[PDB]
Amino acid sequence: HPRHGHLGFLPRKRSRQIRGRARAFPKDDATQKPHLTSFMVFKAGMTHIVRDVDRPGSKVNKKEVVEPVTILEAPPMVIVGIVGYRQTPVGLKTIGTVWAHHTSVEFRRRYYKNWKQSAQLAFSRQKQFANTKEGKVAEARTLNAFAKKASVIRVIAHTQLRKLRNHRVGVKKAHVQEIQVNGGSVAAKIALAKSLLEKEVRVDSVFQQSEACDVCSVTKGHGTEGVVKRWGVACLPRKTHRGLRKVACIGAWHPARVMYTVARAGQHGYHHRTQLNKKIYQIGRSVAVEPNQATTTYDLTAKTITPMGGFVGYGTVRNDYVMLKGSVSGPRRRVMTLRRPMAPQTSRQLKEKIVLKFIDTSSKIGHGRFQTKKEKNQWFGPLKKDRIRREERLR
Amino acid sequence: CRFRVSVALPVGAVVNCADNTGAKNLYVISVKGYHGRLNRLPSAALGDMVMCSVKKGKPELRKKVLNAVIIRQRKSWRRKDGTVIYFEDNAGVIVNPKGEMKGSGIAGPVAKESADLWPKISTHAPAIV
Amino acid sequence: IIDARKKAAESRKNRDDKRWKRVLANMDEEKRKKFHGVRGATRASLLKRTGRKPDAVSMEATIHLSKLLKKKTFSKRAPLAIKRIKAFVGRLMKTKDNRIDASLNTYIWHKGVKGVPGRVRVLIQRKSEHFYTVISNVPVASFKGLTTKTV
Amino acid sequence: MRTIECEFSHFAVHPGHGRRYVPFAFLSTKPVLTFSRPKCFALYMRKKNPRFIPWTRTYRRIHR
RNA sequence: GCAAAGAUCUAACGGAGAUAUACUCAACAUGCAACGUUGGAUACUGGAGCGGGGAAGGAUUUCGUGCCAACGGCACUCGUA
RNA sequence: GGGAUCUCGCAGGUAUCGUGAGGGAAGUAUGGGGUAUACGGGAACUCCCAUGCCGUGCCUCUAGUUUCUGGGGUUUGUCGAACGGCAAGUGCCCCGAAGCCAUCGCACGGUGGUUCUCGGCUGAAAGCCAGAAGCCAAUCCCAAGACCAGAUGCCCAC
RNA sequence: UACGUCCCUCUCCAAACGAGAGAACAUGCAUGGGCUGGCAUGAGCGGUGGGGCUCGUCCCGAGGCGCUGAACCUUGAGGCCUGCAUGCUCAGGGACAC
RNA sequence: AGAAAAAUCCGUAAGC
RNA sequence: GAUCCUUCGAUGUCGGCUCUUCCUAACCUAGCGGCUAAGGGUUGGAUUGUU
């Protein structure tokens, strides 16, 4: 028999952060034009779609299929800084950072454990000194140091949590991360970074409709778990003294100790994963700009992306969103990172173009049999409450 | 060959015979194309060829090993277009080692997943469902 | 200090309504407005701050008990209800001495130890002698349409 | 895709919902029956008549 | 470790057993936890009974007033102490 | 400047974004299509399509689960009856959300160097090519007792 | 001294206990309304019913019909809507830093 | 007491 | 088999189940012309306490 589990995902311990973080970025190609390589989104929930497959030489070619999807809500992001790195015989070392002239309350909240009951003095001396004359000299010196002795440029971006008007996401301090700039020379990278300072960027400027991506996220936590559910070992016979849900032999007489390859009980869930190759099916605009989000060419019904009764435990989707095929690690309300793919993208499946025909918007509570509230009203009629309300309005 | 169907009939199952050869039962002995795994019983689904034996029927085809094809199952399976479908009973048909069907008629409907793999059966099928 | 916090910087930033009036009146329609298109923190505006309330007050409230008792042990459902009611009224009235009346005890226990009702309407009377409360039962035919009141 | 009506209640079944069933004594015209929830299949197996169940389309058509 | 024999809640009296503060301060965030009697509520035993009488064995354990150091494997203002 | 019968006290605190030495380490097997003829019955590579096992997740659908004792039904006892219920350590039966969960459902599982068996090129061994495995690195998981003079926000001190 | 951090208090993407993610007059909490779903037509009243009892009427009677897709439940280890309505908050307290 | 630091300004171990 | 060195104020005895690791004189998979290669695999049942 093969062994139970993968030894390359050890230690099964709790993650150090709750956000997903890209441990590496795609390789830099100086022939292209400068661009950003990442974005942060929030998980809302799941549904399914219908789609006709274009896959020559398949038993499903030219036929319709049903595929589950996950919806991730993506308000725009704000850039507040620039960082540069130099290569040394011991690793990359950062040179300095160039801050924007003005930051927001939600960016500066990230430096406090109790913002409201505090003096709120963050970045005040920095703002004054930047206004003064020596501040311009210092900024120019730092930018020249970047242009002369750097190989990697990154920008510092944060999420706007007041744009995401969510009642179940409780945090008010922004999430901060570094996004690498790829393409072009170092001078061109610095020019793009300087142009995007204190300005907002959208997910459709980073990703296109039928591409793929990687997802960095942290798994759902389950606490202390035994070996049967943690590693997948077999239960023992019913006739067993002292318990069935254990590993029988944990080692031989020699070596006279337990090896690191044997299954024990402990934390399961709340790990970090990177989840290659999630094809993106749709980039939607805000419901303020476009109110017919789940309407297609085949189906002309006017509906939004939120199901009847809302996404369970999350609420309404109010901003731009991304529709990804399949599943991602983590529960609803958790923040996630979308990265440009590392694996080669030459497969027929990874190159196919997607056209959706139907998007399910029925209720996720119980069994949903109505796509819209107008359809529910059409099935029923005026009810007793409707009659008495009309009567009370009349009199 | 085909897409996936949930396995339904492990070794030791008894299914009806839908042909008209005189057999009334089929006893599943093994499944063709099964690669082993420790402790796991071999299981069959629609469109599979199995080694079987008749447990009730005419005595001239009883105490020996034969071949059969599964055409019906009570366990539900999911199609590529997201439809879940299942039958009312498990059924099978006695065939050759090469797929030629002994007998000349079939009783109930047969599934498309098994009529695609065996073109000789779909000829005598009274309905493909 | 608080006066420097309230108003001042916050009331000055409430100049954005004059900016929004000029922009909107310039024949602009369907403009994405977020900041004060207003003042925000409805706790800041609505709260009238009438004043430090008297020592003797009376209130009438409904408590949704079935959400506090859910999958609790059947043998402890009713004592747990007594404790939850005490804590609810205590957090409302800022008292540590809450006395349960005979009517309320009988109502809570009148279907046995596991049959505690799903809603209860109570009357709370705060008294001073040291502060304490007396909680009694208000029999109602139905619970629909009833909100917290002062009597 | 297409929308089908439940065999018992005549509810609408949209793509990706429901279960389908093939009886042994099958009709030639309707070899496959569609059910929208397990409640409908339970009633159908109990052999109840939809016109006596007040929440079905046939009952509503007869009465209302 | 003190997990068989389902289970207690409430008010008023009693008690040193409290409503026990350096001040500011209405109060909560700085005196907790636990005890007896009476009334009310809710349960259990269920006539082969945690009912009412006797033999063998025990020998003051019976009753009233007090007391609460030790003993009643937690506690007592109570006790076959 | 206090302590004890000399001693330190005379300086860091808090909060973000990162580096990456070192350690772990993973994907594997079967079938078909096409080539589809070459050779004289019967080939092969490029390339397409499925499936088995293993691994890491997820809960839209389908299935399992109910102490939401949710709504209904039904038996014996019981409060004078109806109502409301209650007791039978959850009385029993049907349907049942949310949550959890299944190869009983669904998604995903990457790239380069180097050498050997061996085949070569110059060339009297040596110098230079190609090169299944394997080995090393990367992607992936943990990571400063690896004591980071990496960057940065605010206060104090000098 | 200052910046601040921790405890008490509140929330649940976390959780044996520590630790975590958050908020700190905030649609934060409470109750109600609307939505979304579950079950399957409440209490009460009233003019079809196998039969039966008294003076064409008046009564006993399982079940049925109407008011009635009624009635009840719906966030709670923690469904939605204030980019739906009201009520409560009235100098937050303590310890370190020192 | 040992830095994978540095050697009017800014830009040049230069002319600057 | 031989032996009798340790243990007789005691080191729990066959088979199976469960679980991890290592070797090669290579069954399959992979390359060559018999050689290289220990990387990944190596099943489920009737009778028998069995191996």
Ligand SMILES: [K+]
């Ligand atoms: K390494």
Ligand SMILES: [Mg+2]
């Ligand atoms: Mg202990």
Ligand SMILES: [Mg+2]
């Ligand atoms: Mg105990």
Ligand SMILES: [Mg+2]
């Ligand atoms: Mg014990």
Ligand SMILES: [Mg+2]
């Ligand atoms: Mg009893």
Ligand SMILES: [Mg+2]
């Ligand atoms: Mg008896």
Ligand SMILES: [Mg+2]
């Ligand atoms: Mg004692």
Ligand SMILES: [Mg+2]
């Ligand atoms: Mg006495």
Ligand SMILES: [Mg+2]
């Ligand atoms: Mg949780």
Ligand SMILES: [Mg+2]
């Ligand atoms: Mg011998």
Ligand code: NA
């Ligand atoms: Na035993």
Ligand code: NA
């Ligand atoms: Na076995």
Ligand code: NA
């Ligand atoms: Na007990």
Ligand code: NA
């Ligand atoms: Na009783």
Ligand code: NA
């Ligand atoms: Na009961």
